Design an enzyme around this catalytic site. Sequence first.
Site, PDB file in Angstrom:
ATOM      1  N   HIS B  54       0.779  -1.225   0.000  1.00 31.79           N
ATOM      2  CA  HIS B  54       0.000   0.000   0.000  1.00 31.79           C
ATOM      3  C   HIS B  54       0.807   1.269   0.000  1.00 31.79           C
ATOM      4  O   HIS B  54       0.470   2.207  -0.683  1.00 31.79           O
ATOM      5  CB  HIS B  54      -0.927  -0.001   1.195  1.00 31.79           C
ATOM      6  CG  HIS B  54      -2.085  -0.893   1.011  1.00 31.79           C
ATOM      7  ND1 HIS B  54      -1.945  -2.247   0.793  1.00 31.79           N
ATOM      8  CD2 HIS B  54      -3.407  -0.673   1.065  1.00 31.79           C
ATOM      9  CE1 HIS B  54      -3.118  -2.819   0.725  1.00 31.79           C
ATOM     10  NE2 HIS B  54      -4.036  -1.877   0.936  1.00 31.79           N
ATOM     11  N   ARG B  93       0.624 -27.677   2.644  1.00 34.33           N
ATOM     12  CA  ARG B  93       1.345 -26.727   3.442  1.00 34.33           C
ATOM     13  C   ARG B  93       0.707 -25.363   3.385  1.00 34.33           C
ATOM     14  O   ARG B  93       0.387 -24.899   2.313  1.00 34.33           O
ATOM     15  CB  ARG B  93       2.767 -26.638   2.957  1.00 34.33           C
ATOM     16  CG  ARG B  93       3.454 -25.466   3.430  1.00 34.33           C
ATOM     17  CD  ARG B  93       4.694 -25.303   2.667  1.00 34.33           C
ATOM     18  NE  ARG B  93       5.499 -24.299   3.328  1.00 34.33           N
ATOM     19  CZ  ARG B  93       6.208 -23.393   2.663  1.00 34.33           C
ATOM     20  NH1 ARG B  93       6.198 -23.448   1.326  1.00 34.33           N
ATOM     21  NH2 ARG B  93       6.803 -22.372   3.324  1.00 34.33           N
ATOM     22  N   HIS B 139       5.180 -16.750   7.429  1.00 32.64           N
ATOM     23  CA  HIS B 139       5.478 -16.617   6.024  1.00 32.64           C
ATOM     24  C   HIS B 139       5.538 -15.152   5.619  1.00 32.64           C
ATOM     25  O   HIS B 139       4.781 -14.731   4.740  1.00 32.64           O
ATOM     26  CB  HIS B 139       4.446 -17.344   5.170  1.00 32.64           C
ATOM     27  CG  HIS B 139       4.928 -17.664   3.805  1.00 32.64           C
ATOM     28  ND1 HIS B 139       4.974 -18.955   3.298  1.00 32.64           N
ATOM     29  CD2 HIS B 139       5.324 -16.844   2.775  1.00 32.64           C
ATOM     30  CE1 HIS B 139       5.348 -18.912   2.030  1.00 32.64           C
ATOM     31  NE2 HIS B 139       5.564 -17.658   1.692  1.00 32.64           N
ATOM     32  N   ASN B 184       9.612 -19.274   6.802  1.00 37.57           N
ATOM     33  CA  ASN B 184       9.712 -19.645   5.364  1.00 37.57           C
ATOM     34  C   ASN B 184      10.820 -18.834   4.650  1.00 37.57           C
ATOM     35  O   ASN B 184      10.814 -17.573   4.732  1.00 37.57           O
ATOM     36  CB  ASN B 184       8.360 -19.465   4.642  1.00 37.57           C
ATOM     37  CG  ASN B 184       8.491 -19.598   3.124  1.00 37.57           C
ATOM     38  OD1 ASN B 184       8.555 -20.690   2.580  1.00 37.57           O
ATOM     39  ND2 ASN B 184       8.513 -18.470   2.441  1.00 37.57           N
ATOM     40  N   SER B 188      15.406 -14.788   2.043  1.00 40.50           N
ATOM     41  CA  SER B 188      14.576 -13.755   1.448  1.00 40.50           C
ATOM     42  C   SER B 188      14.409 -12.473   2.234  1.00 40.50           C
ATOM     43  O   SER B 188      14.869 -11.428   1.775  1.00 40.50           O
ATOM     44  CB  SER B 188      13.210 -14.364   1.112  1.00 40.50           C
ATOM     45  OG  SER B 188      13.376 -15.585   0.372  1.00 40.50           O
ATOM     46  N   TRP B 455       4.100 -25.883  -5.613  1.00 39.19           N
ATOM     47  CA  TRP B 455       3.562 -24.543  -5.473  1.00 39.19           C
ATOM     48  C   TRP B 455       2.824 -24.160  -6.788  1.00 39.19           C
ATOM     49  O   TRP B 455       3.397 -24.286  -7.844  1.00 39.19           O
ATOM     50  CB  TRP B 455       4.721 -23.581  -5.260  1.00 39.19           C
ATOM     51  CG  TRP B 455       4.297 -22.231  -4.984  1.00 39.19           C
ATOM     52  CD1 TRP B 455       4.143 -21.220  -5.880  1.00 39.19           C
ATOM     53  CD2 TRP B 455       3.916 -21.708  -3.711  1.00 39.19           C
ATOM     54  NE1 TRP B 455       3.648 -20.107  -5.261  1.00 39.19           N
ATOM     55  CE2 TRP B 455       3.520 -20.372  -3.916  1.00 39.19           C
ATOM     56  CE3 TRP B 455       3.899 -22.234  -2.406  1.00 39.19           C
ATOM     57  CZ2 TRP B 455       3.104 -19.533  -2.849  1.00 39.19           C
ATOM     58  CZ3 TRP B 455       3.492 -21.414  -1.352  1.00 39.19           C
ATOM     59  CH2 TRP B 455       3.099 -20.074  -1.584  1.00 39.19           C
ATOM     60  N   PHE B 463       4.055 -12.231  -4.639  1.00 37.62           N
ATOM     61  CA  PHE B 463       4.926 -11.183  -4.136  1.00 37.62           C
ATOM     62  C   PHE B 463       5.713 -10.497  -5.230  1.00 37.62           C
ATOM     63  O   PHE B 463       6.457 -11.151  -5.945  1.00 37.62           O
ATOM     64  CB  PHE B 463       5.883 -11.734  -3.096  1.00 37.62           C
ATOM     65  CG  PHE B 463       5.206 -12.199  -1.861  1.00 37.62           C
ATOM     66  CD1 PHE B 463       4.654 -11.289  -0.988  1.00 37.62           C
ATOM     67  CD2 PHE B 463       5.153 -13.536  -1.547  1.00 37.62           C
ATOM     68  CE1 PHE B 463       4.061 -11.696   0.180  1.00 37.62           C
ATOM     69  CE2 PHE B 463       4.552 -13.963  -0.359  1.00 37.62           C
ATOM     70  CZ  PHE B 463       4.006 -13.025   0.498  1.00 37.62           C
TER      71      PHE B 463
HETATM   72 ZN    ZN Z   1      -6.046  -2.198   0.596  1.00 33.14          ZN
END
Ligand code: ZN
Lengths: 499, 499
Positions: B54, B93, B139, B184, B188, B455, B463
């Site tokens: 956002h 998962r 996560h 996870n 990253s 996945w 992402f």
């Molecule tokens: Zn929003």
Amino acid sequence: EITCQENLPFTCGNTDALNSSSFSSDFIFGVASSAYQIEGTIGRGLNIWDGFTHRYPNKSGPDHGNGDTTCDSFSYWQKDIDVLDELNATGYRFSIAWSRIIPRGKRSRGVNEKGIDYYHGLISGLIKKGITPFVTLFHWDLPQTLQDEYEGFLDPQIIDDFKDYADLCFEEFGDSVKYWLTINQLYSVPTRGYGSALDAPGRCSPTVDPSCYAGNSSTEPYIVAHHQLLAHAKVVDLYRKNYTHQGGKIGPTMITRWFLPYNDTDRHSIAATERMKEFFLGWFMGPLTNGTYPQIMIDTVGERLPSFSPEESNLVKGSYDFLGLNYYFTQYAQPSPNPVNSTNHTAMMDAGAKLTYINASGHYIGPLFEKDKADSTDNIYYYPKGIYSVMDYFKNKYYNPLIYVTENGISTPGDENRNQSMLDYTRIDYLCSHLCFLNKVIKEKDVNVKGYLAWALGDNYEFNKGFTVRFGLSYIDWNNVTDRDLKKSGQWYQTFISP
Amino acid sequence: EITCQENLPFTCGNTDALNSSSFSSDFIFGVASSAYQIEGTIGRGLNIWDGFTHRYPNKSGPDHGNGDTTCDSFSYWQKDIDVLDELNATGYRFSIAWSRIIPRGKRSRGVNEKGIDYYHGLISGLIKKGITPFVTLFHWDLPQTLQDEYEGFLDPQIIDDFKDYADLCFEEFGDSVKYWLTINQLYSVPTRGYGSALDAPGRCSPTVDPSCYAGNSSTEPYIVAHHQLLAHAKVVDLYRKNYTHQGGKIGPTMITRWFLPYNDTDRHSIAATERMKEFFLGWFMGPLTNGTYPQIMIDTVGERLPSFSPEESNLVKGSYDFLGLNYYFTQYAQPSPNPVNSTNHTAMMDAGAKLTYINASGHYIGPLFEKDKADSTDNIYYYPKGIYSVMDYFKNKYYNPLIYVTENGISTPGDENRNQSMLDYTRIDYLCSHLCFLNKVIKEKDVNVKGYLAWALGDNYEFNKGFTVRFGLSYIDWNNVTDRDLKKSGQWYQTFISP
Ligand SMILES: [Zn+2]
Ligand SMILES: *[C@@H]1O[C@H](CO)[C@@H](O[C@@H]2O[C@H](CO)[C@@H](O[C@@H]3O[C@H](CO[C@H]4O[C@H](CO)[C@@H](O)[C@H](O)[C@@H]4O)[C@@H](O)[C@H](O[C@H]4O[C@H](CO)[C@@H](O)[C@H](O)[C@@H]4O)[C@@H]3O[C@@H]3OC[C@@H](O)[C@H](O)[C@H]3O)[C@H](O)[C@H]2NC(C)=O)[C@H](O[C@@H]2O[C@@H](C)[C@@H](O)[C@@H](O)[C@@H]2O)[C@H]1NC(C)=O
Ligand SMILES: *[C@@H]1O[C@H](CO)[C@@H](O[C@@H]2O[C@H](CO)[C@@H](O[C@@H]3O[C@H](CO[C@H]4O[C@H](CO)[C@@H](O)[C@H](O)[C@@H]4O)[C@@H](O)[C@H](O[C@H]4O[C@H](CO)[C@@H](O)[C@H](O)[C@@H]4O)[C@@H]3O[C@@H]3OC[C@@H](O)[C@H](O)[C@H]3O)[C@H](O)[C@H]2NC(C)=O)[C@H](O[C@@H]2O[C@@H](C)[C@@H](O)[C@@H](O)[C@@H]2O)[C@H]1NC(C)=O
Ligand SMILES: *[C@@H]1O[C@H](CO)[C@@H](O[C@@H]2O[C@H](CO)[C@@H](O[C@@H]3O[C@H](CO)[C@@H](O)[C@H](O)[C@@H]3O[C@@H]3OC[C@@H](O)[C@H](O)[C@H]3O)[C@H](O)[C@H]2NC(C)=O)[C@H](O[C@@H]2O[C@@H](C)[C@@H](O)[C@@H](O)[C@@H]2O)[C@H]1NC(C)=O
Ligand SMILES: *[C@@H]1O[C@H](CO)[C@@H](O[C@@H]2O[C@H](CO)[C@@H](O[C@@H]3O[C@H](CO)[C@@H](O)[C@H](O)[C@@H]3O[C@@H]3OC[C@@H](O)[C@H](O)[C@H]3O)[C@H](O)[C@H]2NC(C)=O)[C@H](O[C@@H]2O[C@@H](C)[C@@H](O)[C@@H](O)[C@@H]2O)[C@H]1NC(C)=O
Ligand SMILES: *[C@@H]1O[C@H](CO)[C@@H](O[C@@H]2O[C@H](CO)[C@@H](O)[C@H](O)[C@H]2NC(C)=O)[C@H](O)[C@H]1NC(C)=O
Ligand SMILES: *[C@@H]1O[C@H](CO)[C@@H](O[C@@H]2O[C@H](CO)[C@@H](O)[C@H](O)[C@H]2NC(C)=O)[C@H](O)[C@H]1NC(C)=O
Ligand SMILES: *[C@@H]1O[C@H](CO)[C@@H](O[C@@H]2O[C@H](CO)[C@@H](O)[C@H](O)[C@H]2NC(C)=O)[C@H](O)[C@H]1NC(C)=O
Ligand SMILES: *[C@@H]1O[C@H](CO)[C@@H](O[C@@H]2O[C@H](CO)[C@@H](O)[C@H](O)[C@H]2NC(C)=O)[C@H](O)[C@H]1NC(C)=O
Ligand SMILES: *[C@@H]1O[C@H](CO)[C@@H](O)[C@H](O)[C@H]1NC(C)=O
Ligand SMILES: *[C@@H]1O[C@H](CO)[C@@H](O)[C@H](O)[C@H]1NC(C)=O
Ligand SMILES: *[C@@H]1O[C@H](CO)[C@@H](O)[C@H](O)[C@H]1NC(C)=O
Ligand SMILES: *[C@@H]1O[C@H](CO)[C@@H](O)[C@H](O)[C@H]1NC(C)=O
Ligand SMILES: *[C@@H]1O[C@H](CO)[C@@H](O)[C@H](O)[C@H]1NC(C)=O
Ligand SMILES: *[C@@H]1O[C@H](CO)[C@@H](O)[C@H](O)[C@H]1NC(C)=O
Ligand SMILES: *[C@@H]1O[C@H](CO)[C@@H](O)[C@H](O)[C@H]1NC(C)=O
Ligand SMILES: *[C@@H]1O[C@H](CO)[C@@H](O)[C@H](O)[C@H]1NC(C)=O
Ligand SMILES: *[C@@H]1O[C@H](CO)[C@@H](O)[C@H](O)[C@H]1NC(C)=O
Ligand SMILES: *[C@@H]1O[C@H](CO)[C@@H](O)[C@H](O)[C@H]1NC(C)=O
Ligand SMILES: *[C@@H]1O[C@H](CO)[C@@H](O)[C@H](O)[C@H]1NC(C)=O
Ligand SMILES: *[C@@H]1O[C@H](CO)[C@@H](O)[C@H](O)[C@H]1NC(C)=O
């Protein structure tokens, strides 16, 4: 002698008969907006309204809309400024998003420079165009981090964080901003945010609403209203003590309504209207003019009502240079029971009044204001003479304060298409009839009203309504938000300011 | 003897030649998802990814999409369960959103009962269908309140909050959940969230990215990785000490890549590949198997690398019952300079390696993985034999751990229409060729791999990509998210599990 119509059809839409020249030459006319409604989330931290609209999307609006991008004034603020310039408006009220300039809430955690720059550019642009900024320090968008650390205004730790925030603003913008609204509509957050859970943060008793994550509709609104007053009083004391060199004025914004008796010869209806006046207005106006709560509130609410210490009482009393009044409509009040022991009791029942728009003999209070599609016996109707009665009341009951009308407006359905939305004559009638009664009260009662800001500049996200109603004077295409186009109401307002 | 193809066209898409019966009878096959990608914001508090998407919408994706509603698994989790049931999958998962069950971050501030109920229903439904839950405690969706109170994983106060969160989960769900993934992809967040500001929270040095609100790409990834390890070690110690009666296993999820030399006869390219292996894998695997960082890291990073105390070192060492490996692709590495004094230095430069998908004589590493439209010399290519090399490496270098492949998948463009998106043969080739090399490594090297989770279950928010790429095995219409329809890949996977 000034005559004003209270029922359709109004004829004050004619600027030969009513225009800015009917008022004193220094009178400020403008429009208003708020940060959450117009900015978008780009470039700022999250606040409780981003949290609320996301966690409970069916309270954000029937379309589940939110303030994620809304009209994107973060990018197009310069278009906001061209609309104002096109109106030849001398006033613009906007709010600084606490989240944008201190994303992590507590000031010692660092300030967002890019955020501070955003508002410098905005303020520089308004002033270059001869427009006076009225800046609201807090328009309900509290940093989510403060709500999760200590539940926001429910805790007294909010007072120092709010004061460090405000300090940062007077220091950064105070050299150009000479008008500060501390908290917008005092009554709203405590009742809707902590009583009924219709607004952020959405706390309330489990049986008032089972979606609520936590709360107590019976005690928390009183604890929140109290802290809002201490918070506000502490910012005003910081302002008048540390930034008096800036030569500004600072005041609270009160949501004002007028109340009329449902039956104007039944004493029970008359007592309920006087009780409404005290629970709705006096709840805040009493501490601000006297340092204490109204006596009917002290009697009725008892232990659930917090006490001001003598030091706090002294700080809150007289803690304003002016009042910003938001007025929209008036209600009829009749008695209603206050069941203090029911598990679904709310602070709003304590007034012992039921509010309607139609009195005992079936007379509707005025023309339609907002059509409720789910229930039409819920429709809201406005009453132009209400602005006359409220102002006369404030003058007589509250020591003849300097007043600015900081919000006054009417929505039209988002269902309407572009052609229908640009032809908003119902908005000309609303604004012109209130302006006719405002001019009359300034003249007949000598109320010290020094300005008027119509809501809103353009179509934006509406709290609890999404994009299903439009309040702007300028039109915004939700499929392409670049342009702000003046509707009929905007063209009318333009001709009113410069006849 | 098992033969596997490394280049198109693959022929392992035939289940007469490869199916679940090629593996041990207890082998778990399933799919994976994450809370932020599939749930929607309804009913939960806000986390740093809601904040990031956002505040910086152009980092949320080229379409500016976010996880506001995504595929709305908060409402349609039962449809997720019917897709699994249709695959006859034995493993799923998913992750518990910390924000949903403790919206205000710190446990003493109260838990969200309705949130806890959401996951009880989910877990009850999976187990009724004979599907084993692997639940990720974290996560990337940290409560925004903890990021604003003390900057999340940058501060050691995260350790106790994370531990109180995890405690709440083992206590609430531990009776049914027997497999816990603590954090996870360890690599990253520190690099993308604190080095390059491509992921939440988006901190980095002002000259690495001027949008960043704060940060230091040179020091913060090392401080964050360190805390992630202590946090993780402390949850595993809580689990093995306080919830051993539950008879579960708990482990970290490591993002694994394989690295090959750009030039496989230039010693500089060979040293850069060995350095990559250490900075990418050893950074975490070294503390987990030995209680200390790799020696090349201790030499290269010097003062910027935190030290483990003897007590912390003992807690982190051996702090897993298994490892979850996420594998996607492999890279070619060549030397690249480490300019420690440049103001745009990042922890990722410390490896002294530049990564590519094409080696020195122009050979592309494998088939296309992800087309980069802005720059095609940035396209990503996969390498099926990488899962073979990574597993063999983990067995030999890291004490023959019990392993579960917890993520493996490939996206296709969201540009494609419904007919094109349901015919995802490029996904059958990706999965079948990795499954062919995974079976071969289990058989030839005797690696202790006990499961595989593709996945993702269905199309969801990706992402940094919005809804512009699709990873699901089942299709979701963004204009109506109710249905999850099995694509060709999903029908292939179904026939693979039950030949
Ligand atoms: Zn929003
Ligand atoms: C503008 O602010 C003024 C204050 O600056 C308001 O006036 C105060 O009004 C108070 C009433 O609400 C009043 O306090 C009450 O005083 C009673 C007597 O106190 C003295 O004499 C006692 C007699 O034995 C003695 O015991 C005391 O020690 C004092 O010497 C007292 O009995 C009252 O307490 C009972 O009732 C209150 C509810 O009102 C309960 O809270 C309390 O438990 C108890 O049952 C009350 O005392 C207050 O008790 C609570 C405590 O937190 C307070 O500290 C304590 O004061 C007070 O005397 C006056 N102050 C002055 C200086 O006059 C004024 O109110 C209006 O005007 C008064 C005259 C009254 O009519 C109010 O109803 C009016 O609203 C404010 N104006 C407006 C417009 O509201
Ligand atoms: C698995 O964990 C093992 C530990 O449990 C790792 O072995 C340790 O490896 C350390 C090297 O990184 C090593 O510590 C060094 O010890 C030097 C000598 O210390 C003793 O003797 C000194 C000699 O005068 C004396 O002064 C000391 O007081 C001790 O009695 C010491 O000089 C080193 O310090 C210099 O270099 C380091 C960088 O490596 C700098 O940080 C430091 O400022 C200084 O310049 C170093 O000491 C460490 O200094 C920093 C401080 O925080 C530490 O407390 C201190 O230990 C240590 O001896 C062994 N431990 C044992 C029990 O053998 C092992 O590492 C691998 O194996 C060793 C043999 C070595 O080859 C490493 O490079 C290998 O990677 C871990 N295994 C893996 C696979 O990583
Ligand atoms: C606005 O309020 C006024 C005052 O309350 C309303 O007028 C009152 O209306 C009452 C009816 O609701 C009248 O009482 C009734 O009187 C009749 C005749 O004697 C009797 O048969 C009824 O049972 C009732 O009597 C009361 O019963 C309860 C007892 O506890 C009590 O002691 C009795 O009074 C009442 O007299 C009348 N008062 C006055 C001063 O007019 C008014 O109601 C409207 O006007 C009256 C005249 C009548 O036509 C009502 O039906 C009519 O609604 C109310 N206005 C409106 C528009 O609602
Ligand atoms: C994979 O790496 C290997 C090893 O680095 C590459 O082979 C080396 O390629 C070098 C050229 O980049 C060769 O050096 C050159 O030798 C010629 C002939 O004497 C000389 O005129 C050049 O100036 C250069 O000499 C170096 O200059 C810098 C000095 O500091 C240094 O002392 C000199 O060595 C080098 O001999 C060669 N080594 C070997 C063992 O073959 C390989 O590069 C590729 O193969 C070589 C045979 C040559 O055809 C290259 O043009 C070709 O790219 C590299 N592979 C690829 C595919 O990039
Ligand atoms: C909201 O808070 C009030 C204050 O604690 C609660 O009311 C009290 O309830 C207890 C238990 O029934 C009584 O012993 C007290 O006499 C009440 N105090 C007052 C000042 O009213 C109330 O129960 C809470 N409501 C809910 C719905 O949580
Ligand atoms: C309901 O509202 C109407 C409108 O103000 C009231 O009607 C007025 O009443 C006064 C006094 O009786 C009359 O002189 C006016 O002529 C009435 N106006 C209209 C438009 O008829 C009415 O009294 C209110 N009813 C009650 C019960 O309060
Ligand atoms: C990131 O943090 C590091 C550590 O404080 C900064 O590097 C230090 O910079 C000072 C001032 O130039 C030097 O005196 C030190 O020698 C440096 N320390 C180390 C350990 O490298 C660095 O400047 C910061 N970077 C930015 C971009 O903020
Ligand atoms: C780049 O990658 C290719 C593909 O693996 C390497 O080529 C192989 O090299 C070996 C050893 O020279 C040969 O026996 C194979 O026949 C080659 N395969 C192909 C498909 O031609 C190549 O050596 C790599 N180049 C460098 C410089 O590392
Ligand atoms: C503005 O309104 C006044 C009445 O208040 C009127 O006398 C005047 O002529 C109007 N001005 C214009 C320009 O129409
Ligand atoms: C609105 O959403 C809430 C979940 O937060 C749910 O309890 C409620 O039933 C919903 N209301 C309607 C009318 O669907
Ligand atoms: C704007 O208002 C001023 C002050 O009343 C007036 O003098 C000026 O002509 C107006 N400009 C426009 C373009 O109407
Ligand atoms: C005014 O500012 C000074 C300097 O920061 C500080 O000591 C003082 O407490 C402030 N006064 C207020 C907030 O009334
Ligand atoms: C609960 O509150 C609602 C609205 O205030 C009311 O309709 C209902 O009768 C109340 N329930 C009880 C048991 O008093
Ligand atoms: C969006 O609106 C602006 C203003 O009307 C226009 O110039 C621009 O071309 C529009 N964009 C598209 C994609 O039509
Ligand atoms: C499954 O694959 C094996 C080879 O691993 C093959 O021999 C077997 O016949 C296949 N089963 C089916 C049902 O096709
Ligand atoms: C993305 O948005 C950021 C504002 O947060 C801005 O600095 C940057 O220039 C934007 N990038 C592009 C390519 O427009
Ligand atoms: C599901 O898998 C089990 C175990 O291999 C098998 O026995 C069963 O027939 C399968 N069911 C379906 C509907 O394929
Ligand atoms: C286990 O739980 C007990 C009881 O709450 C507590 O005293 C102890 O510190 C916990 N042990 C851990 C987290 O290792
Ligand atoms: C800054 O970093 C970029 C990418 O790592 C590089 O292209 C550039 O040359 C660097 N600038 C300096 C002054 O080193
Ligand atoms: C949305 O999708 C579901 C599943 O296909 C369908 O039953 C429902 O009618 C759809 N809604 C609309 C508005 O088409």
